[PDB]
Amino acid sequence: EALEAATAPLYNRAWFDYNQRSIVPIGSGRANDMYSPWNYPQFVTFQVTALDENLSGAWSGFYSVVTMANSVINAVETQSEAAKTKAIAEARLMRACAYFYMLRIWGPVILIEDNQKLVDNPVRPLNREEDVFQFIINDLNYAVDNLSEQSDKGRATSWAAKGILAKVYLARSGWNNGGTRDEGDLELARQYASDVCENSGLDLMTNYEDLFKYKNNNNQESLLAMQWVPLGEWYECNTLLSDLAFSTEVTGGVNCWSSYNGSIDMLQQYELADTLRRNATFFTKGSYYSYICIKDGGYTYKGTASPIKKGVPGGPDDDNDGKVKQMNSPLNTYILRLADVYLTYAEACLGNNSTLSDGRGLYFFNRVRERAKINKKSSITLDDIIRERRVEFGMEYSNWYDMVTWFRYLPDKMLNYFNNQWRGYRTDAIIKDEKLHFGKYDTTFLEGPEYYTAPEFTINIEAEDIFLPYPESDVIQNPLLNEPPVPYTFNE
Ligand SMILES: OC[C@H]1O[C@@H](O[C@H]2[C@H](O)[C@@H](O)[C@H](O[C@H]3[C@H](O)[C@@H](O)[C@H](O[C@H]4[C@H](O)[C@@H](O)[C@H](O[C@H]5[C@H](O)[C@@H](O)[C@H](O[C@H]6[C@H](O)[C@@H](O)[C@H](O[C@H]7[C@H](O)[C@@H](O)[C@H](O)O[C@@H]7CO)O[C@@H]6CO)O[C@@H]5CO[C@H]5OC[C@@H](O)[C@H](O)[C@H]5O)O[C@@H]4CO[C@H]4OC[C@@H](O)[C@H](O)[C@H]4O)O[C@@H]3CO)O[C@@H]2CO)[C@H](O)[C@@H](O)[C@@H]1O
Ligand SMILES: [Cl-]
Ligand code: NA
């Protein structure tokens, strides 16, 4: 039971190459959560090339998770029967997560149970999307059975396993399935998600803004998160700080450079009453914050833009216990929140119906709206769920993965949706009412699209743009990355 020391880096170092940076433009930028012409716009505008350094970063990161999980699983043979099944359960959970991410970025990817290690650059084929689902599910089922129902602050539980496995079943339900969601998968998703919702004994944090404070790492709503070391050494700190934060006035002096702004389209998703989630995600004019710049009575953003609040914990003195320096944020990276399980339950209860007007699924939906301190809905559609998921998880680097899942379910719907997100548009001044307005002054406020700063190249998003390309460097090393995927031969 020094396994625990070997399974520990599965939460931090394993994910580092991914989390270092790429996680933001890919997870949140390609969803058009937010935007900058000078910080990797191409992900927002669908102009990404095979040479893109974020693709390389992300791709190595996820496979680093895979390598380490496989090292551990193997290592559990190169070294108590309950300590061992737990260790393997953690490795395979992370391995499922890494692939479930890749599956919704590239689609086909290479399925590796065995690292080889003797061969620097193995020539392995891509495996089919359905095989990648079945691999992820094999891993999650093991983690469901072999993780415990409660654990130490920061470690995985069987509730997390069930949580993920509910999202996976929901995502497979409609994937390439000819316009309908598979009822078998919908039922599987309902039962894993309702079992978490009803039996975990867990509860949403009363205040949504609390989720995103250092002092609240591994709260009861955090089912699975990247456990970053406060002021950690390289390979084990959260380096996203300087990329997220727009000005030193919100970092207690620490160096930063973010030019990201919440997108027109993203800011428009927030209902008029939904300002607790909006505030906790982006700064907008007038927005007050008691827990940032605590020394000066709190910070009030007084600009006309939409810089990122979420992932910007404030200064080292702003209840962060001094754990804030450049490229060193003390926040965990969320992977799965209980809120996500609530919405996932809901979507799985909607199923193939137009509307959902009753049941426990709608209860856990409204339960999320309840926390945002906004009005419940008496019935919901898929479009409500999409919108609720966007505002709930804005700037948590996961809205793109969901949009890919949806695109895989209703491709023409979502292509029309991607093309009506004002992608690449921006506006001089976002001003606030008594309600958000988008435009500019000109010598008096000019409102609407006509006064947006429009992109000046072609943006016509089509099916082949959605999944990103394989990183060119890897393609050169393994030419099968250009060939059709093949069926994986599963192990029994
Ligand atoms: O035009 C009209 C219009 O204009 C408007 O204005 C615009 C303007 O036009 C536009 O130019 C502008 O653009 C900005 C942009 O918005 C901004 O974000 C960007 O900033 C960059 C910074 O300048 C730059 O310093 C920063 O550098 C960091 C790297 O990005 C980062 O990857 C790197 O990390 C290193 C790490 O440092 C190192 O420690 C590490 O070492 C490890 C080692 O690897 C281990 O092996 C070992 O174990 O441990 C070691 C550590 O212990 O390796 C990492 C990389 O792998 O860190 C650097 C900086 O780091 C530090 O050290 C070096 C010191 O010199 C430095 O001081 C110190 O910080 O990158 C920023 C952007 O980053 C990334 O994303 C963007 C992309 O382009 C980059 O390629 C990418 O790197 O700057 C530009 C401009 O310069 O926006 C303007 C508006 O704001 C007007 O407003 C309008 O009116 C006009 O009309
Ligand atoms: Cl693209
Ligand atoms: Na359009």
Curated annotation (Swiss-Prot):
The principal location of this protein is membrane
Q: What SUPFAM superfamilies is this protein classified in?
A: TPR-like (SSF48452)
Any one Gene Ontology cellular component term annotated for this protein: cell outer membrane
User: Per the UniProt entry, what are the Gene Ontology biological process annotations, in alphabetical order?
Assistant: symbiotic process benefiting host; xyloglucan catabolic process
GO terms assigned for molecular function = polysaccharide binding
Q: Which one Pfam family would you cite for this protein? A: SusD-like_3
Query: What compartments host this protein?
Result: Cell outer membrane
Key word Nucleotide-binding present: no
Taxonomy, superkingdom: Bacteria
| Pathway(s) served | Glucan metabolism; xyloglucan degradation
Other comments?
Gut bacteria supply the human body with energy from dietary polysaccharides through glycosidases that are absent in the human genome. Xyloglucans are a ubiquitous family of highly branched plant cell wall polysaccharides present in the vegetables we consume. Enzymes involved in xyloglucan degradation mediate the conversion of otherwise indigestible plant polysaccharides to short-chain fatty acids.
What the protein does comes down to: Polysaccharide-binding protein present at the surface of the cell. Probably mediates xyloglucan-binding before xyloglucan transport in the periplasm for degradation.
UniProt similarity note? Belongs to the SusD family.
Question: Which named protein is this?
Answer: SusD-like protein BACOVA_02651
Q: Could you tell me which species this protein originates from?
A: Bacteroides ovatus (strain ATCC 8483 / DSM 1896 / JCM 5824 / BCRC 10623 / CCUG 4943 / NCTC 11153)
